[PDB]
Structure formats: structure tokens, C-alpha cells
Design an enzyme around this catalytic site. Structure first.
Site, PDB file in Angstrom:
ATOM      1  N   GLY A   1      90.089 115.594 -11.543  1.00 30.91           N
ATOM      2  CA  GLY A   1      91.131 114.914 -12.312  1.00 30.91           C
ATOM      3  C   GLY A   1      92.352 115.765 -12.551  1.00 30.91           C
ATOM      4  O   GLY A   1      93.177 115.339 -13.338  1.00 30.91           O
TER       5      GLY A   1
ATOM      6  N   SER B   1      93.936 117.236  -9.832  1.00 27.84           N
ATOM      7  CA  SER B   1      94.569 117.063  -8.533  1.00 27.84           C
ATOM      8  C   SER B   1      95.942 116.406  -8.615  1.00 27.84           C
ATOM      9  O   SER B   1      96.076 115.408  -9.311  1.00 27.84           O
ATOM     10  CB  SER B   1      93.625 116.321  -7.621  1.00 27.84           C
ATOM     11  OG  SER B   1      92.596 117.043  -7.004  1.00 27.84           O
ATOM     12  N   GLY B   2      96.942 116.927  -7.943  1.00 32.48           N
ATOM     13  CA  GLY B   2      98.335 116.473  -7.863  1.00 32.48           C
ATOM     14  C   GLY B   2      99.264 117.087  -8.904  1.00 32.48           C
ATOM     15  O   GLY B   2     100.516 117.046  -8.800  1.00 32.48           O
TER      16      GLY B   2
ATOM     17  N   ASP C   1      99.117 118.788   2.059  1.00 34.30           N
ATOM     18  CA  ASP C   1      98.673 117.953   0.971  1.00 34.30           C
ATOM     19  C   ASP C   1      99.745 117.621  -0.048  1.00 34.30           C
ATOM     20  O   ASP C   1      99.475 117.923  -1.209  1.00 34.30           O
ATOM     21  CB  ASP C   1      97.556 118.673   0.184  1.00 34.30           C
ATOM     22  CG  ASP C   1      96.539 117.714  -0.376  1.00 34.30           C
ATOM     23  OD1 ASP C   1      96.591 116.539   0.014  1.00 34.30           O
ATOM     24  OD2 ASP C   1      95.713 118.090  -1.198  1.00 34.30           O
TER      25      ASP C   1
ATOM     26  N   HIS D   1      95.745 113.584  -0.883  1.00 36.35           N
ATOM     27  CA  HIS D   1      94.323 113.306  -0.801  1.00 36.35           C
ATOM     28  C   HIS D   1      93.933 112.419  -1.971  1.00 36.35           C
ATOM     29  O   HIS D   1      92.806 111.934  -2.155  1.00 36.35           O
ATOM     30  CB  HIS D   1      93.561 114.682  -0.795  1.00 36.35           C
ATOM     31  CG  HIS D   1      93.410 115.289  -2.158  1.00 36.35           C
ATOM     32  ND1 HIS D   1      93.924 116.532  -2.509  1.00 36.35           N
ATOM     33  CD2 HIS D   1      92.868 114.786  -3.286  1.00 36.35           C
ATOM     34  CE1 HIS D   1      93.708 116.761  -3.761  1.00 36.35           C
ATOM     35  NE2 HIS D   1      93.074 115.733  -4.254  1.00 36.35           N
TER      36      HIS D   1
END
Lengths: 56, 245
Positions: B193, B195-196, B102, B57
């Protein structure tokens, strides 16, 4: 003389994704991402748009 | 995999209102996704010297840059690796409506140089079972308070326990899927920030890739669980793509 751009939520989700993609609202405020501006329009019943991408 | 040359120091501050600042170089597999502009928009974790695992995403392009070995992004004086991307391998089963599946694999042009400050994370095995109530770790440069709108210069760490699908449904109900795992609701939250990046649970000495920051509270609510891509349920795809590429 122009544009606009409305911020979108994920409707199938009633939360936001965690990315840092600031957006400059028509209000003069910075949103961490777009879903944030949407969730703030929804709760505040406002209709702020995206001026420009990135920080104000 | 999953043993920092540099040893992390998780204090009781890592457990309350929005974690702490890490020891520089203690999460070597921690990377930052950035613009050509040098703008951090997401994190990732290094699984090899060639691939990076992130959230789908996030929308990483070949044009984006993976920065290895960073502490203080506010520096200009650290020994970091700016690796280019060759290929982005985003799950085909990712659901954009739902945020399911995801995971995205990034293939690097420039192999990263394992160092004291760069290393990879151990990937789990599908068969793996990480018990609810397990205390784990999340790391990143996501906002400290939702209300900051300025991401931190230095990496942060939060200590937070995993939750049972069953008890997350209490807070999210039907949203919560099978390729999703929850953690939080304990005074700590992943925010814009983050995310991942990783959700790492220690397994037998190794720090093991258990979740990917996905989504959660709109407002980074510390009383609400944060949702992460469930690695064990997506790990075989990791193996497969890595193999065939």
C-alpha cells in the site's frame, strides 16, 4: 461445484511489489496482495488458492 | 515546488521499526489512489495541479480516483479532493517481468486546488546526483507490519538513506537496474500500500522526487533495502509527456 484461481509471483524478481490488493485465500486468510500469497506458498510449500479477490 | 505550508516533523521514531505518523498536511503532494469503492491500493505524488506521478505496476484505471489532501483515511471529516482521471500515461519501457521503468503519469480531469495541504513535489533533473548515505523520506498508508493486513488510517513517514547500486546488488544482485535506486535496510521498510508514493530527498530547500515505491522484500524486511523507480533516469520522459499532453 467450482473454481479456484492460483496466485502468481514475478519470477524475474524474488521480491514482491508494494501495492495493497488483498486477496482471500482458500485457507480463509487475507494476503496483502497476490505475490504475497505466492511467496507464502513457495516458502511454506503449500498450494492455497484465491477464493475471492479482496478481503475475507 | 517542494515546500509544505505545513512543516513536517521527522523524529528519531521516523527512523526505527516502521516509521511514524506524520503531521497532518505536511506532504501536500502525497495522494492516495483509490477504487470507485474508496479503497486505497496505492499512493502517488502530485507534480502539478493536473498530473500525478505513480508506479506502473499499480494498474490505475480512469475509473480510479486520486484523493488529495488526506490525513486520516479513517475520518469522514477532512477537506479532501477527489479528482477524476482522464488519461493514464504508462511508460512503454516498463518491464513487468523485471519491474523496470515503473513510472506512470496520470492526467486529471479536475485540476487540483493547491492549498495549505495540497501542493506539488519538486521533480529532479536527470543530471542530478543524490549521494548514497543520504538520508531521505518515504511516505504512505502501506502496512506497518506485514502481519497487519489492514493498512493504517493516517499517513506515515520513514527516514531512510539511499544506497549505492553496488551495495544493493549485495542483497538483490542482478535484479537491480539502471532505472532503479535503493533505500533502506536500516530498520525501516515500504510495505503493501506504499507503492507509487514518494522517496523525497531535500535539495536546497526543496523536497525532491527521487524514487517511487516499487518493490522489495516479500515480507517488508527492515534489514533489506526496498527498491524504488529511479526518478532522475525517467524524469525527461516526465517532461516530454507533460509537454505533448
Amino acid at each position: 461445484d467450482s473454481l479456484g484461481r492460483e496466485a502468481k509471483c514475478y519470477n524475474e524478481l524474488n521480491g514482491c511489489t508494494y501495492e495493497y490488493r488483498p486477496v482471500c485465500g482458500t485457507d480463509g486468510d487475507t494476503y496483502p496482495n497476490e505475490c504475497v500469497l505466492c511467496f507464502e506458498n513457495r516458502k511454506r510449500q503449500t498450494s492455497i488458492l484465491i477464493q475471492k479477490s479482496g478481503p475475507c | 515546488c517542494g515546500v509544505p505550508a505545513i512543516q513536517p516533523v521527522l523524529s528519531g521514531l521516523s527512523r526505527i521499526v516502521n516509521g511514524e505518523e506524520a503531521v497532518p498536511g505536511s506532504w501536500p503532494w502525497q495522494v492516495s489512489l483509490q477504487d470507485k469503492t474508496g479503497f486505497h491500493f496505492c499512493g502517488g505524488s502530485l507534480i502539478n495541479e493536473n498530473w500525478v506521478v505513480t508506479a506502473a505496476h499499480c494498474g490505475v484505471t480512469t475509473s480510479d480516483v486520486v484523493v488529495a489532501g488526506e490525513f486520516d483515511q479513517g475520518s469522514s471529516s477532512e477537506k479532501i479532493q477527489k479528482l477524476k482521471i482522464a488519461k493514464v500515461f504508462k511508460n512503454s519501457k516498463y518491464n513487468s517481468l523485471t519491474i523496470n521503468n515503473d513510472i506512470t503519469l496520470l492526467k486529471l480531469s479536475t485540476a487540483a486546488s493547491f492549498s495549505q495541504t495540497v501542493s506539488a513535489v519538486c521533480l529532479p533533473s536527470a543530471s542530478d546526483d543524490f549521494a548514497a548515505g543520504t538520508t531521505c523520506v518515504t511516505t504512505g498508508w502501506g502496512l506497518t507490519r506485514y502481519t497487519n493486513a489492514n493498512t493504517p488510517d493516517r499517513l506515515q513517514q520513514a527516514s531512510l538513506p539511499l544506497l549505492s547500486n553496488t551495495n544493493c546488488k549485495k542483497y538483490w544482485g542482478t535484479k537491480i537496474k539502471d532505472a532503479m535506486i535503493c533505500a533502506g535496510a536500516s530498520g525501516v521498510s515500504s510495505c503493501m500500500g506504499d507503492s507509487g508514493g514518494p522517496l523525497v530527498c531535500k535539495k536546497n530547500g526543496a523536497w525532491t522526487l527521487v524514487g517511487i515505491v516499487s518493490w522489495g522484500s516479500s515480507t517488508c524486511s527492515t534489514s533489506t533495502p526496498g527498491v524504488y523507480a529511479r526518478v532522475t533516469a525517467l524524469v525527461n520522459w516526465v517532461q516530454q509527456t507533460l509537454a505533448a499532453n
